[PDB]
Amino acid sequence: ARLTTDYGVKQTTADDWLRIVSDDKIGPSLLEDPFARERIMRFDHERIPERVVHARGSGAFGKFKVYESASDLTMAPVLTDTSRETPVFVRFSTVLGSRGSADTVRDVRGFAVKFYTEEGNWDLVGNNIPVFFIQDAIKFPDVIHAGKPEPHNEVPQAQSAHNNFWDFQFNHTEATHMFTWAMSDRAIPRSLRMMQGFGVNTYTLINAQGKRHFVKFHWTPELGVHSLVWDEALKLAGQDPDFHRKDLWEAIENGAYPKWKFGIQAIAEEDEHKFDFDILDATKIWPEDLVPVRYIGEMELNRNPDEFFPQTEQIAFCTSHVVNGIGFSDDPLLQGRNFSYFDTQISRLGVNFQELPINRPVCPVMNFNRDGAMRHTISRGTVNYYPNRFDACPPASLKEGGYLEYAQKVAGIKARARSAKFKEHFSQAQLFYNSMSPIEKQHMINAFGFELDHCEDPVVYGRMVQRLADIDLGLAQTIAEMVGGEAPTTTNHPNHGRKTINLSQTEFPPATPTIKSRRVAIIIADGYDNVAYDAAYAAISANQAIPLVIGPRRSKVTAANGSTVQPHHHLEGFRSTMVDAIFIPGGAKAAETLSKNGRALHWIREAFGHLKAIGATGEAVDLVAKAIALPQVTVSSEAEVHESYGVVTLKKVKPESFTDAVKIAKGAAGFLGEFFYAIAQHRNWDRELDGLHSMIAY
């Protein structure tokens, strides 16, 4: 392999333009040089427009397969064939930010899946939140413009924390349910692999008998639903803007393929109008206590892209992409969406976007669509229209797999309006808030407090405080004292206190106790205990977790016994925000050095403040106890394992200390068991519920 021009001509150098030159005097560059001009021209035109929304995203290839046929609901083979595996590509994303914005901002997350079925491409373009801000697609530009950077100065980037966003939220009551979800932990996921996915809009399924069902699609992570805490999310946005992109890529590269269970909620054609809300209203969820989610399949991502730009950046999804057996409903949000995903590709990619490798279906494509810019397809023949004398490219009958258009009855008048049930805008917002656990309510309170603090206009946060009273009077009062304004004492939308299942993240734990893919920092310094170090390192690895050694330097650290190791990073190059938990082995010399290292003390205080599991043995126990300096947090004093607020310690290490079985469960006996259990729980919420984090500086 040797350097060539794009037209195949080999070149002798990639370092000099053709110019006039002499040993002692340089001259002008020549216009004639085709190699140089081509290099610069290709470079000059590398960029294409970013997606108008969901510009920041990461994707991977995978496979989908149903383990239970849904033939009773649909005749689409992708959902009925339990023997075939369907290839997919999934792109996750944020919504408001442009291409270089951070992964860990507070925002809705896109969850788009392209199913390359034998019957054509089916795209399920969803989000990690089940509802949306608006009921009619016509207002998408309004809500997006309001959330995006303000027009005069293009501030702020990838943030809803500003005047215009909250101005729209207050003035468009349809969005009430949505901004409640937006302030919940759902909007700051720990990993794209640890969040749900939803079709959001109401679609339809048609079976072999022609019977139709209205449906909602669900994706549920087998690792469970987990989130970051705000201070941590903001730090990561700067310290590692690629946190989620790297998290996904790393897991797949390590063989920890993320999986999701695929479920369907179905309502028979005949029961369309049997609910208090309109089942086609995208600002409404279908309470699972009324319509259960039926899980029938599983999807896993098992292969990273070969090259990001031609694949992840150029992939195009659209709600318009449906295969036989799957259809649309009169959902007024979905209806306008179909128009958009085709239209936008014209300028973002080009009219022939379906020819791009990543977008092409895996089955035969036959039609008379022709030409267009950058056309690669060459079609032989003298005819390009139907009907024609050769009966070339005839339509497919229904029996041959032709798309079945449900003959839905339609009656009414042409008008710019929605039906009666769409007028209800507060009930589910209250239901959602009511269903949140205490810690989740606290996080939402902190979110409103931060967001409205960043609204400079007293009219904006003042009005929002009034609106919050329509969700919960107590909530309004708390926010009012935090950001200003006056919380009303009454409301025309009383909160009756009902709650529902499967809304709180507490109802989505991992399929089984695990710490798979979690990152655990092992903090050391010269003189560390090689014994505790070796035990933890092996146990972390053997439990599919990632051990990351952090030391004062990234060259060499010497253990108390003389053995050495090269840490992965030094204390200044990384931060606790980047890991799931920290472990510090003993060694008097090491503990003393770390106790005088401000950066190290911060690692401990921050990990504590961010509610992460902390484990320490030997002399490191006193290090942690003194770093935290909280009487509420007790530690081991002898050879007994001790746990307090997710802080696991063992001061006196004995021969049996690391011989106990490693059981990831409540009330484990050994040190590693209890430590891993704290990690498996993701975060220690009691630490925050008891206000301990508020006492620490991090």
Residues making up the binding site for heme:
51, 91, 140, 337, 341, 348
Supply the minimum distance, in Å, between the C-beta of residue 146 and its own copies.
4
Output the DSSP codes for 81-137.
-SS--EEEEEEEE-SSS-TTS-TTSSS--EEEEEEEETTEEEEEEEESSSS-S-SSG
Q: Is 273 a catalytic residue?
A: no
Rounded to 10 degrees, what is the CA torsion of 636, 641, 644, 645?
140
Token pair in block for residue 222: 């087998």
Q: Minimum Å distance from CB 689 to its own copies?
A: 26
Answer whether 293's CB lies under 8 Å from 265's CB.
yes
Q: Which two tokens stand for residue 208?
A: 């072999």
Are 645 and 652 in contact, with CB atoms under 8 Å apart?
no
Q: How many CB atoms lie within 10 A of CB 330?
A: 15
Least Å from the CB of residue 168 to its own copies:
6
Q: Which is nearer to ligand HDD, 198 or 671 (CB)?
A: 198
Catalytically annotated residue among 54, 177, 213, 693: 54
Which of ligand HDD, its own copies, none has residue 399 at its interface (CB below 5 to 8 Å by kind)?
Answer: none
The partner in contact with residue 282, picked from ligand HDD, its own copies, none with C-beta cut-offs of 5 to 8 angstroms by kind, is ligand HDD
Beta carbon of residue 291, minimum distance to its own copies (angstroms, whole number): 19
* Binding-site partner at residue 126 among its own copies, ligand HDD, none, CB < 5 to 8 Å by type: ligand HDD
Task: Choose from its own copies, ligand HDD, none: what does 342 bind? Cβ within 5-8 Å by kind.
Answer: its own copies
Residue 312 binding partner per list its own copies, ligand HDD, none, with a CB distance cut-off of 5 to 8 Å that depends on partner kind? its own copies
- Between 360 and 556, CB nearer to ligand HDD: 360
Which residues define the annotated binding site? Answer: 51, 91, 140, 337, 341, 348
CB of 623 to its own copies, least distance (A): 22
| Of the candidates 558, 613, 626, 627, the residue with the CA atom closest to the CA atom of residue 583 | 613
Q: Pick from ligand HDD, its own copies, none: which does 132 bind, CB < 5 to 8 A by kind?
A: ligand HDD
Three-class DSSP category at 602: helix
Query: CA 202, CA 213: separation in Å to the nearest integer?
Result: 10
Q: Which amino acid is at 460?
A: V
Spot the catalytic one: 121, 127, 359, 495: 127
CB of 321 to ligand HDD, least distance (A): 11
Whose Cβ is closer to ligand HDD: residue 317's or residue 433's? Answer: 317
Structure-token pair, residue 275: 């609910």
Residue 427 CA to its chain's centroid (Å): 27
Q: Which residues bind ligand HDD (CB under 6 A)?
A: 40, 44, 51-54, 57, 91, 93, 110, 112, 125-127, 132, 137, 140, 200-201, 282, 316-317, 333, 336-337, 340-341, 344
> What is the rounded CA–CA span in Å between residue 488 and residue 490?
6
Measured between alpha carbons, how far is 465 from 484 in angstroms, rounded to an integer? Answer: 8
Q: Which is nearer to ligand HDD, 110 or 615 (CB)?
A: 110
Residue 395 per-residue DSSP state: P
The verdict on whether 454 is a catalytic residue reads no
Question: In the complex with ligand HDD, which residue's Cβ is closer, 53 or 647?
Answer: 53
Work out how close the CB of 658 gets to its own copies at its nearest, in angstroms, rounded to a whole number.
Answer: 29
Strands (E), 546-683: 546-551, 557-558, 564-565, 569-570, 581-584, 613-617, 642-644, 647-650
Contacts of 407 (CB under 8 A, 6+ apart): none
Nearer to ligand HDD, 319 or 435 (CB): 319
Q: How far is CA 420 from CA 269, 276, 408, 426, in A?
A: 19, 11, 20, 15
E strand residue ranges, 168-223: 197-198, 203-206, 212-221
* Residue 93 binding partner per list its own copies, ligand HDD, none, with a CB distance cut-off of 5 to 8 Å that depends on partner kind: ligand HDD
Handedness of CA 531, 535, 541, 547 (dihedral sign): negative
Burial class (CB in 10 A: 0-12, 13-18, 19+), 390: exposed
Q: Which residue number has the CB closest to ligand HDD?
A: 110
Q: Return the structure tokens found at 545.
A: 């977790």
ω into 387 cis (within 30 of 0):
yes
Residue 219 interacting partner from its own copies, ligand HDD, none (CB closer than 5 to 8 Å by kind): none
543 closest CA partner among 647, 662, 668, 684? 662
Decide whether 132 or 583 has the Cβ nearer to ligand HDD.
132
Tokens coding 671: 């040190």
Our CB check for its own copies shows the closer of 464 and 647 to be: 464
CB of 92 to ligand HDD, least distance (A): 7
Residues annotated catalytic, as ranges: 54, 127
